[PDB]
Amino acid sequence: DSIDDKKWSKLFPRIVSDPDRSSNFMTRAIYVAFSAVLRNRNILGQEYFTKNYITEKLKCMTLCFRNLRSNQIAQLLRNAGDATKDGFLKEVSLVITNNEGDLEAIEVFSMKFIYFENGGVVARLSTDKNGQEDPHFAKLAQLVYEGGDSVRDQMVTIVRSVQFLCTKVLEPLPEEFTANFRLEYTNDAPSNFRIDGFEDSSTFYTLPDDIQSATIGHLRPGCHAANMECWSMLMS
Amino acid sequence: ARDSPYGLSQGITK
């Protein structure tokens, strides 16, 4: 059970069935997906991205480690991704607003997470706030790890969907906007736990009532699960 | 130290 793609090996682990690499793939997952989103929505210019292979089928622009700014943003997502190791990360989302730092978003690219108790089969419960089941829970809990190649296809689906939404579906962003990364901790995460680069906040983000959405794709490595969605006012 | 469930990063502004 391994991903034998020659290109895949550079950015990703060849094996995603064990806890460490399952969590590590997620970190690499966050990095690639949000790189494509930032690039294809033209939040950042080309010069912050390095052309990379995901598979022999698909290329992608990933945040450049050799540019000052893009390296900071890559580091930011790497910290968020590392929190996946102990099940401390509920959600990371690229949040676009009119002004820094509005609560209600114009557009949001969200990755939402779920962790599994042991063997990577039974899902750890993820709740409100009020005790209510999380919106992204059911869909991800029903899933079963189907091998490394299934995960490879999921990563390809996500990046291709990201490219599709920005190229064919989404209206352009305004001349003036502010885009920042906002995350949510799991309840399991202790008070002593904080993710570098992210300020503590009592507020997250909100969406207008008339918000439209689209599913970018899901991820099911051996011991983790994620769903990526696009929320925006600029569809069609 | 942290009594809040949310994290905010510095952003990119155009």
mmCIF file of C-alpha atoms in Angstrom:
data_model
loop_
_atom_site.group_PDB
_atom_site.id
_atom_site.type_symbol
_atom_site.label_atom_id
_atom_site.label_comp_id
_atom_site.label_asym_id
_atom_site.label_seq_id
_atom_site.Cartn_x
_atom_site.Cartn_y
_atom_site.Cartn_z
ATOM 1 C CA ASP A 1 0.000 0.000 0.000
ATOM 2 C CA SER A 2 2.110 2.864 -1.326
ATOM 3 C CA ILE A 3 1.913 5.643 -3.904
ATOM 4 C CA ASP A 4 4.547 4.795 -6.511
ATOM 5 C CA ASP A 5 4.116 7.937 -8.606
ATOM 6 C CA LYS A 6 7.563 9.394 -9.311
ATOM 7 C CA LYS A 7 6.365 12.989 -9.071
ATOM 8 C CA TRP A 8 4.160 12.504 -5.994
ATOM 9 C CA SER A 9 7.170 11.528 -3.885
ATOM 10 C CA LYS A 10 8.653 15.037 -3.841
ATOM 11 C CA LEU A 11 5.847 16.967 -2.160
ATOM 12 C CA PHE A 12 4.090 14.092 -0.411
ATOM 13 C CA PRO A 13 4.782 10.937 1.586
ATOM 14 C CA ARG A 14 4.567 7.709 -0.422
ATOM 15 C CA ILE A 15 2.676 6.141 2.494
ATOM 16 C CA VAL A 16 -0.312 7.668 4.300
ATOM 17 C CA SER A 17 -1.710 4.805 6.369
ATOM 18 C CA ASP A 18 0.151 5.367 9.645
ATOM 19 C CA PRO A 19 -0.652 8.213 12.107
ATOM 20 C CA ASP A 20 2.525 10.285 11.578
ATOM 21 C CA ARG A 21 2.473 10.250 7.790
ATOM 22 C CA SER A 22 -1.304 10.584 7.756
ATOM 23 C CA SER A 23 -0.906 13.795 9.731
ATOM 24 C CA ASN A 24 2.126 14.799 7.680
ATOM 25 C CA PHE A 25 0.259 14.328 4.404
ATOM 26 C CA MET A 26 -2.403 16.677 5.753
ATOM 27 C CA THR A 27 0.273 19.302 6.367
ATOM 28 C CA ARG A 28 1.443 18.882 2.777
ATOM 29 C CA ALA A 29 -2.202 18.810 1.695
ATOM 30 C CA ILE A 30 -2.915 22.194 3.282
ATOM 31 C CA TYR A 31 0.239 23.612 1.687
ATOM 32 C CA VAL A 32 -0.532 22.574 -1.901
ATOM 33 C CA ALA A 33 -4.276 23.284 -1.896
ATOM 34 C CA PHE A 34 -4.001 26.788 -0.442
ATOM 35 C CA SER A 35 -1.054 27.512 -2.714
ATOM 36 C CA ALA A 36 -3.255 26.767 -5.718
ATOM 37 C CA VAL A 37 -6.115 28.792 -4.231
ATOM 38 C CA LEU A 38 -3.874 31.805 -3.548
ATOM 39 C CA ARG A 39 -2.274 31.521 -6.984
ATOM 40 C CA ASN A 40 -5.382 30.851 -9.067
ATOM 41 C CA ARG A 41 -7.461 33.539 -7.351
ATOM 42 C CA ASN A 42 -4.495 35.840 -7.978
ATOM 43 C CA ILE A 43 -4.204 36.843 -4.331
ATOM 44 C CA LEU A 44 -0.456 36.499 -4.860
ATOM 45 C CA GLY A 45 1.507 36.909 -8.094
ATOM 46 C CA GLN A 46 3.410 34.154 -9.859
ATOM 47 C CA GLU A 47 6.722 35.185 -8.337
ATOM 48 C CA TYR A 48 5.718 33.692 -4.978
ATOM 49 C CA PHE A 49 5.208 30.240 -6.457
ATOM 50 C CA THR A 50 7.347 27.381 -7.739
ATOM 51 C CA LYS A 51 6.081 25.133 -10.517
ATOM 52 C CA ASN A 52 5.810 21.649 -9.048
ATOM 53 C CA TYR A 53 4.431 18.248 -9.936
ATOM 54 C CA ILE A 54 1.688 16.597 -7.943
ATOM 55 C CA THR A 55 1.516 13.589 -10.229
ATOM 56 C CA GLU A 56 2.680 12.778 -13.758
ATOM 57 C CA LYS A 57 -0.778 13.973 -14.774
ATOM 58 C CA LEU A 58 -0.964 17.324 -12.988
ATOM 59 C CA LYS A 59 1.204 20.359 -12.278
ATOM 60 C CA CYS A 60 0.609 23.093 -9.687
ATOM 61 C CA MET A 61 1.965 26.360 -8.313
ATOM 62 C CA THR A 62 3.208 25.946 -4.748
ATOM 63 C CA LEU A 63 4.406 28.634 -2.337
ATOM 64 C CA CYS A 64 8.062 29.445 -2.901
ATOM 65 C CA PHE A 65 10.392 28.607 -0.023
ATOM 66 C CA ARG A 66 13.035 30.911 -1.500
ATOM 67 C CA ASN A 67 10.998 34.117 -1.429
ATOM 68 C CA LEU A 68 10.744 36.020 1.864
ATOM 69 C CA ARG A 69 6.978 36.533 1.911
ATOM 70 C CA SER A 70 5.843 33.224 0.437
ATOM 71 C CA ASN A 71 8.104 31.405 2.876
ATOM 72 C CA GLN A 72 6.371 33.164 5.766
ATOM 73 C CA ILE A 73 2.962 32.092 4.476
ATOM 74 C CA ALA A 74 4.217 28.557 3.853
ATOM 75 C CA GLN A 75 5.529 28.501 7.422
ATOM 76 C CA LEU A 76 2.144 29.713 8.640
ATOM 77 C CA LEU A 77 0.319 26.790 7.026
ATOM 78 C CA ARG A 78 2.992 24.363 8.197
ATOM 79 C CA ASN A 79 2.274 25.359 11.793
ATOM 80 C CA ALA A 80 -1.450 24.882 11.266
ATOM 81 C CA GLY A 81 -0.731 21.531 9.646
ATOM 82 C CA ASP A 82 1.479 20.367 12.507
ATOM 83 C CA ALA A 83 -1.457 20.791 14.899
ATOM 84 C CA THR A 84 -3.127 17.927 13.013
ATOM 85 C CA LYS A 85 -0.653 15.563 14.674
ATOM 86 C CA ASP A 86 -2.431 15.621 18.034
ATOM 87 C CA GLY A 87 -5.932 16.400 16.791
ATOM 88 C CA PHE A 88 -5.828 20.042 17.845
ATOM 89 C CA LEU A 89 -6.963 21.581 14.567
ATOM 90 C CA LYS A 90 -10.670 21.847 13.785
ATOM 91 C CA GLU A 91 -10.386 24.024 10.671
ATOM 92 C CA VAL A 92 -8.054 26.246 8.652
ATOM 93 C CA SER A 93 -9.634 28.639 6.166
ATOM 94 C CA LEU A 94 -8.483 31.307 3.757
ATOM 95 C CA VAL A 95 -10.807 34.179 4.609
ATOM 96 C CA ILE A 96 -11.382 37.052 2.188
ATOM 97 C CA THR A 97 -13.088 40.244 3.346
ATOM 98 C CA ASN A 98 -13.520 43.846 2.263
ATOM 99 C CA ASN A 99 -11.549 45.287 5.170
ATOM 100 C CA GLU A 100 -8.996 44.013 7.659
ATOM 101 C CA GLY A 101 -10.386 42.512 9.609
ATOM 102 C CA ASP A 102 -14.085 42.118 8.926
ATOM 103 C CA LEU A 103 -16.025 39.311 10.576
ATOM 104 C CA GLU A 104 -18.293 38.583 7.607
ATOM 105 C CA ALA A 105 -16.495 37.161 4.587
ATOM 106 C CA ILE A 106 -16.812 37.878 0.891
ATOM 107 C CA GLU A 107 -15.192 34.534 0.142
ATOM 108 C CA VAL A 108 -13.781 31.567 2.086
ATOM 109 C CA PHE A 109 -11.685 28.545 1.173
ATOM 110 C CA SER A 110 -12.111 26.140 4.110
ATOM 111 C CA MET A 111 -10.459 22.881 5.098
ATOM 112 C CA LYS A 112 -12.259 21.176 7.993
ATOM 113 C CA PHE A 113 -10.827 18.272 9.944
ATOM 114 C CA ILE A 114 -11.735 15.140 11.901
ATOM 115 C CA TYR A 115 -9.643 12.666 13.889
ATOM 116 C CA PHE A 116 -9.967 8.935 14.498
ATOM 117 C CA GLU A 117 -9.525 7.147 17.838
ATOM 118 C CA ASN A 118 -7.417 4.146 16.805
ATOM 119 C CA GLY A 119 -6.843 2.016 13.720
ATOM 120 C CA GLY A 120 -8.086 5.021 11.779
ATOM 121 C CA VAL A 121 -11.621 3.633 11.659
ATOM 122 C CA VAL A 122 -13.922 5.125 14.306
ATOM 123 C CA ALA A 123 -14.172 8.917 14.225
ATOM 124 C CA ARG A 124 -13.547 11.012 17.308
ATOM 125 C CA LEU A 125 -16.593 13.212 17.929
ATOM 126 C CA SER A 126 -16.426 16.864 16.886
ATOM 127 C CA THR A 127 -18.998 19.180 18.420
ATOM 128 C CA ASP A 128 -20.199 22.681 19.224
ATOM 129 C CA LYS A 129 -20.072 25.116 21.443
ATOM 130 C CA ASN A 130 -23.679 24.045 22.081
ATOM 131 C CA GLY A 131 -23.029 20.324 21.955
ATOM 132 C CA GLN A 132 -24.268 20.094 18.374
ATOM 133 C CA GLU A 133 -22.516 17.879 15.828
ATOM 134 C CA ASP A 134 -20.209 19.721 13.431
ATOM 135 C CA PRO A 135 -21.545 20.312 9.875
ATOM 136 C CA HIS A 136 -18.537 18.595 8.303
ATOM 137 C CA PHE A 137 -18.570 15.622 10.667
ATOM 138 C CA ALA A 138 -21.071 13.161 9.166
ATOM 139 C CA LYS A 139 -19.719 13.262 5.604
ATOM 140 C CA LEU A 140 -16.146 12.597 6.748
ATOM 141 C CA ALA A 141 -17.036 10.035 9.432
ATOM 142 C CA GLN A 142 -18.783 7.770 6.909
ATOM 143 C CA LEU A 143 -15.580 7.525 4.861
ATOM 144 C CA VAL A 144 -13.107 4.642 5.030
ATOM 145 C CA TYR A 145 -9.387 4.746 4.219
ATOM 146 C CA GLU A 146 -9.185 2.972 0.859
ATOM 147 C CA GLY A 147 -5.426 2.985 0.313
ATOM 148 C CA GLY A 148 -2.678 5.353 -0.775
ATOM 149 C CA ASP A 149 -3.807 5.736 -4.377
ATOM 150 C CA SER A 150 -7.287 6.774 -3.232
ATOM 151 C CA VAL A 151 -5.593 9.583 -1.319
ATOM 152 C CA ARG A 152 -3.539 10.472 -4.399
ATOM 153 C CA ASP A 153 -6.727 10.812 -6.456
ATOM 154 C CA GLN A 154 -8.308 12.946 -3.729
ATOM 155 C CA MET A 155 -5.387 15.363 -3.793
ATOM 156 C CA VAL A 156 -5.628 15.563 -7.567
ATOM 157 C CA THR A 157 -9.398 16.137 -7.433
ATOM 158 C CA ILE A 158 -8.924 18.977 -4.934
ATOM 159 C CA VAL A 159 -6.263 20.812 -6.946
ATOM 160 C CA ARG A 160 -8.192 20.353 -10.210
ATOM 161 C CA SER A 161 -11.391 21.564 -8.546
ATOM 162 C CA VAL A 162 -9.520 24.561 -7.149
ATOM 163 C CA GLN A 163 -8.287 25.353 -10.656
ATOM 164 C CA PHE A 164 -11.789 24.897 -12.073
ATOM 165 C CA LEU A 165 -13.567 27.158 -9.562
ATOM 166 C CA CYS A 166 -11.118 30.026 -10.011
ATOM 167 C CA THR A 167 -10.911 29.720 -13.778
ATOM 168 C CA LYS A 168 -14.512 28.919 -14.756
ATOM 169 C CA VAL A 169 -16.862 29.686 -11.863
ATOM 170 C CA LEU A 170 -15.676 32.530 -9.640
ATOM 171 C CA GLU A 171 -16.038 36.196 -10.558
ATOM 172 C CA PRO A 172 -12.876 38.236 -9.916
ATOM 173 C CA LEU A 173 -12.096 39.618 -6.461
ATOM 174 C CA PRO A 174 -12.475 43.373 -5.916
ATOM 175 C CA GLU A 175 -9.514 45.711 -6.508
ATOM 176 C CA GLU A 176 -9.423 46.198 -2.742
ATOM 177 C CA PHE A 177 -9.629 43.269 -0.331
ATOM 178 C CA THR A 178 -7.957 41.660 2.660
ATOM 179 C CA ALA A 179 -7.200 37.949 2.778
ATOM 180 C CA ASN A 180 -6.035 36.231 5.952
ATOM 181 C CA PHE A 181 -5.863 32.742 7.428
ATOM 182 C CA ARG A 182 -8.250 31.997 10.294
ATOM 183 C CA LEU A 183 -8.323 28.726 12.226
ATOM 184 C CA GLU A 184 -10.342 26.973 14.915
ATOM 185 C CA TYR A 185 -8.932 24.767 17.667
ATOM 186 C CA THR A 186 -10.512 21.512 18.773
ATOM 187 C CA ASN A 187 -11.817 21.283 22.333
ATOM 188 C CA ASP A 188 -9.190 18.609 23.013
ATOM 189 C CA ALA A 189 -6.383 21.138 22.520
ATOM 190 C CA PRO A 190 -5.090 22.316 25.942
ATOM 191 C CA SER A 191 -4.875 25.935 27.122
ATOM 192 C CA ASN A 192 -1.084 25.799 26.842
ATOM 193 C CA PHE A 193 -1.388 24.992 23.141
ATOM 194 C CA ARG A 194 -1.143 27.819 20.617
ATOM 195 C CA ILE A 195 -0.262 27.673 16.921
ATOM 196 C CA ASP A 196 2.559 29.996 15.840
ATOM 197 C CA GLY A 197 1.535 32.839 13.555
ATOM 198 C CA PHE A 198 -2.085 32.810 14.680
ATOM 199 C CA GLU A 199 -3.376 35.278 17.269
ATOM 200 C CA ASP A 200 -5.956 34.159 19.813
ATOM 201 C CA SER A 201 -9.439 35.386 18.930
ATOM 202 C CA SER A 202 -12.938 35.089 20.373
ATOM 203 C CA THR A 203 -14.289 35.612 16.860
ATOM 204 C CA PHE A 204 -13.831 33.443 13.771
ATOM 205 C CA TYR A 205 -15.601 34.437 10.583
ATOM 206 C CA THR A 206 -19.204 34.598 9.391
ATOM 207 C CA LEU A 207 -20.981 34.248 6.057
ATOM 208 C CA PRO A 208 -23.840 36.252 4.501
ATOM 209 C CA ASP A 209 -27.240 34.523 4.453
ATOM 210 C CA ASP A 210 -27.310 34.427 0.653
ATOM 211 C CA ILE A 211 -23.903 32.734 0.448
ATOM 212 C CA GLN A 212 -23.222 30.218 -2.316
ATOM 213 C CA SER A 213 -20.959 27.184 -1.975
ATOM 214 C CA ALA A 214 -19.152 24.369 -3.778
ATOM 215 C CA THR A 215 -17.318 21.206 -2.741
ATOM 216 C CA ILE A 216 -13.625 21.206 -3.620
ATOM 217 C CA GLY A 217 -12.961 17.716 -2.279
ATOM 218 C CA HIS A 218 -12.333 15.447 0.677
ATOM 219 C CA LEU A 219 -9.221 13.787 2.082
ATOM 220 C CA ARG A 220 -9.030 10.376 3.728
ATOM 221 C CA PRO A 221 -5.533 9.346 4.791
ATOM 222 C CA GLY A 222 -5.147 6.433 7.206
ATOM 223 C CA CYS A 223 -5.828 8.274 10.459
ATOM 224 C CA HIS A 224 -7.189 11.670 9.382
ATOM 225 C CA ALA A 225 -9.998 13.230 7.351
ATOM 226 C CA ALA A 226 -10.652 16.625 5.787
ATOM 227 C CA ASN A 227 -13.272 18.349 3.655
ATOM 228 C CA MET A 228 -12.444 21.392 1.542
ATOM 229 C CA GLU A 229 -15.166 23.783 0.389
ATOM 230 C CA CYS A 230 -15.481 27.168 -1.306
ATOM 231 C CA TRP A 231 -17.835 29.843 0.006
ATOM 232 C CA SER A 232 -18.228 33.060 -1.955
ATOM 233 C CA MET A 233 -20.387 35.899 -3.198
ATOM 234 C CA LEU A 234 -18.587 35.811 -6.542
ATOM 235 C CA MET A 235 -19.890 32.575 -8.070
ATOM 236 C CA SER A 236 -21.088 32.539 -11.690
ATOM 237 C CA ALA B 1 -2.832 31.039 28.299
ATOM 238 C CA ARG B 2 -5.402 30.703 25.514
ATOM 239 C CA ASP B 3 -9.085 30.780 26.444
ATOM 240 C CA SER B 4 -10.343 31.205 22.876
ATOM 241 C CA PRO B 5 -10.960 28.592 20.152
ATOM 242 C CA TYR B 6 -9.931 30.757 17.177
ATOM 243 C CA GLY B 7 -6.664 31.761 15.541
ATOM 244 C CA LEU B 8 -6.097 34.804 13.342
ATOM 245 C CA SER B 9 -3.111 35.287 11.057
ATOM 246 C CA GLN B 10 -1.707 38.453 9.528
ATOM 247 C CA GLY B 11 -2.987 38.785 5.987
ATOM 248 C CA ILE B 12 -2.425 39.862 2.410
ATOM 249 C CA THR B 13 -4.032 43.137 1.356
ATOM 250 C CA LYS B 14 -4.583 44.441 -2.168
#
